[PDB]
């Protein structure tokens, strides 16, 4: 409603770096807000794509940003009559970024890994890896829970059970308020998908450079399965956290599986022990129900509500014809221990191939009326197809069915404006939460400042 579409702020990165593929707000030890930006195709030292991260200080004029440096060199360790190998070429460093406290977590889901033992090997596969940084202190650490040293022959004998070689850890990421990093790995367990959780503090204290294979005892991974409903489900394509069991001491996980049960798609709510509490099934096959998940209390009852995006949903139209437009689902948490019923509200896109619901960002309370609001992206929507971001306001019964404000892309065609979103943070300290929008196709980030209601 009260976002300013006239005076925007533009940050930019190198051409072709996909600057803006992922973003988040970052507060230093003094509470000063900055913008961490991932650029998963930034060039490295060997003039080859390795990804990169940028930490943008808040300036109303925007501009260029300094780099948050990480080690981009391939590593090799000969230990235990084996040869460990990391490969960072085309690893996509910055395909996901998240900030918690004064720590930044940037992940490379396509970092490859292999283990050589004489003539056998573990196979060169994308286990993924995440890089952790404390910018003020310079501390660095890594976390790659799916690295292993089991040779290829063993997996074949055991029918590829517990095969974490293609995890792509860091594909999606989130951090609980207690400081526990949760990584989505949609390729874990032979593309069933898995989750990897570990406290940030224990990642730093247990990491040493050059080890490549080290134990993080406090970590917790989800479990493999023989149920074909989970096969190729990409469990962990998206991840989020919230309170859904009524116990404020426990933190619940929200996991998206957009190809679950033969591309039906699903979203599951679990406890910290990966025990399933609820499961929301997709409405339409190949709609990618679960592509994006968001958690926020929109109706002001104190109970976190769930939003699920299905960007490829095909709406039924006249003459028995379907139209891909995308759809968002709203699930209001019931009072006390009860199951999440049918959707409370269905928001459906308008522009063909607009992919409404590709990203869903909680905005906090934008208009300061006592109800949290959200922003939904249609990266190829709008009458021109350049992209749109739609603001829906909260209310006592959930969300408004019509948008309060529409943000048209200021970028050219193909910018994927809205592919990444992040809100609920006041960056200029004016008392109103603001919105940052990524457009990796144009290698830029746009900042929308909230202003008093007119």
């Amino acid at each position: 409603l009260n976002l300013d579409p006239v005076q925007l702020t533009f940050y930019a990165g190198p051409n072709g770096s996909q600057f803006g593929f992922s973003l988040d707000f970052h507060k230093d030890s003094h509470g000063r807000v900055a913008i961490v930006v991932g650029a998963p195709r930034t060039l490295g030292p060997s003039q080859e794509e390795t990804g990169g991260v940028f930490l943008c200080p808040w300036r109303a004029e925007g501009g260029q940003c300094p780099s948050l440096l990480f080690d981009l060199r391939d590593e090799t360790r000969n230990v235990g009559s084996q040869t460990l190998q990391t490969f960072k070429a085309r690893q996509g460093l910055g395909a996901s970024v998240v900030s918690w406290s004064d720590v930044i977590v940037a992940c490379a889901p396509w970092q490859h890994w292999n283990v050589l033992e004489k003539t056998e090997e573990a196979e060169k596969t994308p286990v993924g890896s995440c890089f952790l940084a404390q910018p003020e202190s310079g501390r660095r650490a890594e976390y790659s829970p799916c690295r292993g040293n089991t040779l290829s022959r063993i997996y074949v004998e055991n029918d590829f059970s517990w095969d974490k070689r293609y995890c792509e850890a860091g594909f999606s990421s989130v951090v609980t308020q207690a400081g526990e990093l949760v990584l989505g790995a949609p390729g874990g367990y032979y593309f069933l998908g898995l989750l990897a959780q570990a406290p940030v503090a224990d990642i730093f204290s247990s990491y040493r450079p050059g080890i490549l294979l080290w134990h993080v005892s406090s970590q917790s991974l989800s479990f493999d399965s023989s149920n074909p409903e989970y096969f190729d489900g990409y469990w962990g394509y998206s991840v989020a956290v919230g309170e859904f069991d009524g116990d404020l001491n426990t933190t619940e996980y929200v996991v998206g599986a957009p190809t679950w049960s033969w591309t039906l798609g699903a979203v599951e709510i679990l406890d910290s022990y990966y025990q399933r509490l609820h499961r929301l099934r997709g409405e339409q096959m190949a709609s990618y129900f679960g592509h994006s998940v968001a958690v926020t209390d929109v109706n002001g009852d104190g109970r976190h509500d769930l939003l699920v995006g299905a960007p490829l949903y095909m709406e039924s139209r006249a003459d028995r014809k379907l139209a891909e437009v995308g759809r968002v689902y709203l699930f209001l948490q019931p009072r006390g221990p009860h199951a999440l019923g049918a959707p409370s509200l269905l928001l459906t896109g308008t522009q063909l191939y607009g992919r409404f619901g590709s990203a869903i960002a909680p905005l906090g309370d934008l208009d300061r009326d006592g109800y949290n609001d959200i922003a939904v992206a249609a990266p190829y929507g709008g009458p021109s197809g350049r992209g749109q971001v739609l603001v829906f306001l909260g209310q006592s019964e959930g969300l408004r069915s019509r948008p309060s404000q529409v943000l048209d892309s200021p970028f050219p065609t193909g910018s994927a404006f809205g592919f990444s979103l992040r809100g609920a943070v006041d960056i200029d300290d004016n008392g109103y939460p603001d919105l940052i929008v990524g457009a990796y196709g144009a290698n830029q980030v746009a900042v929308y400042r909230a202003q008093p209601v007119v």
Partner: antibody, heavy 119, light 108 residues
Framework: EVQLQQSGAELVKPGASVKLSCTASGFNIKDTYVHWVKQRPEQGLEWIGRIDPANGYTKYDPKFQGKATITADTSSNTAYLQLSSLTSEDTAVYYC????????????WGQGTSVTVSS | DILMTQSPSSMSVSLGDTVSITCHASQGISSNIGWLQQKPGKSFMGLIYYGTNLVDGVPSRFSGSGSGADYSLTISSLDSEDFADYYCVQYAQLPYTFGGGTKLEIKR
């Protein structure tokens, strides 16, 4: 806290067999590798072998191939070391070892089990 | 197998001295070495892993260094508890092999 609690001292005769144990305390035995080390005053320290309790796969120094047999039961959270056809040279102290962080390290040690072979 | 030559076999030193134990390997092991401590009539305690990294709980007066096939364990300002046995161990290749050992004795 990580503690490796081994069995009490054994006193056996030559030709017989003995099975030592290494129970994990404060952690899951399945977490890391579990090694076995032999110590003697003259010969010093010698590496017997290792086991991954998650799957049971083992490695051995070819010197101990035949006598040493390493196993593990995740239920009782314990790893074992069996010694067969015992000899006076098998009289030694036996330690179970696991790493801290590095997968291939030798950081945490049990108190050690004494073995004495004699007629 | 990799032979681990540890020297000296023993040394007579006093409190507060800065001593250095060395360990030579028959071939390069690329810092894949650990250091151990065995107090009199007791079990082992890990000091160093991967050549330089201190085990959690070990005082900072201990320190490891070296590269290739030559490494060193240094103890700055000896404490009354540091008088004990010390061994090096390589894990670059299987089987793991240990050094002969080094005993720190009180000088008088």
């Amino acid at each position: 806290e990580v503690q490796l609690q081994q069995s009490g001292a054994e006193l056996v005769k030559p030709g017989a067999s003995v099975k030592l144990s290494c129970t994990a305390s404060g952690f899951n035995i399945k977490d890391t590798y579990v090694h076995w080390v032999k110590q003697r005053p003259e010969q010093g320290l010698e590496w017997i072998g290792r086991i991954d309790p998650a799957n049971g796969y083992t490695k051995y120094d070819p010197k101990f191939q035949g006598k040493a047999t390493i196993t593990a039961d995740t239920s009782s959270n314990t790893a074992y070391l069996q010694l067969s056809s015992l000899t006076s040279e098998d009289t030694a102290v036996y330690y179970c070892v696991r790493p801290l962080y590095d997968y291939y390290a030798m950081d945490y040690w049990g108190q050690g089990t004494s073995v004495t072979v004699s007629s | 197998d990799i032979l681990m030559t540890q020297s000296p076999s023993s040394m007579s030193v006093s409190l507060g001295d800065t001593v250095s134990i060395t360990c030579h390997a028959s071939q390069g092991i690329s810092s894949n070495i650990g250091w151990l401590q065995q107090k009199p009539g007791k079990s082992f305690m890990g000091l160093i892993y991967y050549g330089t990294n201190l085990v959690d709980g070990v005082p900072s007066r201990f320190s490891g260094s070296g590269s290739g096939a030559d490494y060193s364990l240094t103890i700055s300002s000896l404490d009354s508890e540091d008088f004990a046995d010390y061994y090096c161990v390589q894990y670059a290749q299987l089987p793991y092999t240990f050094g002969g050992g080094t005993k720190l004795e009180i000088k008088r």
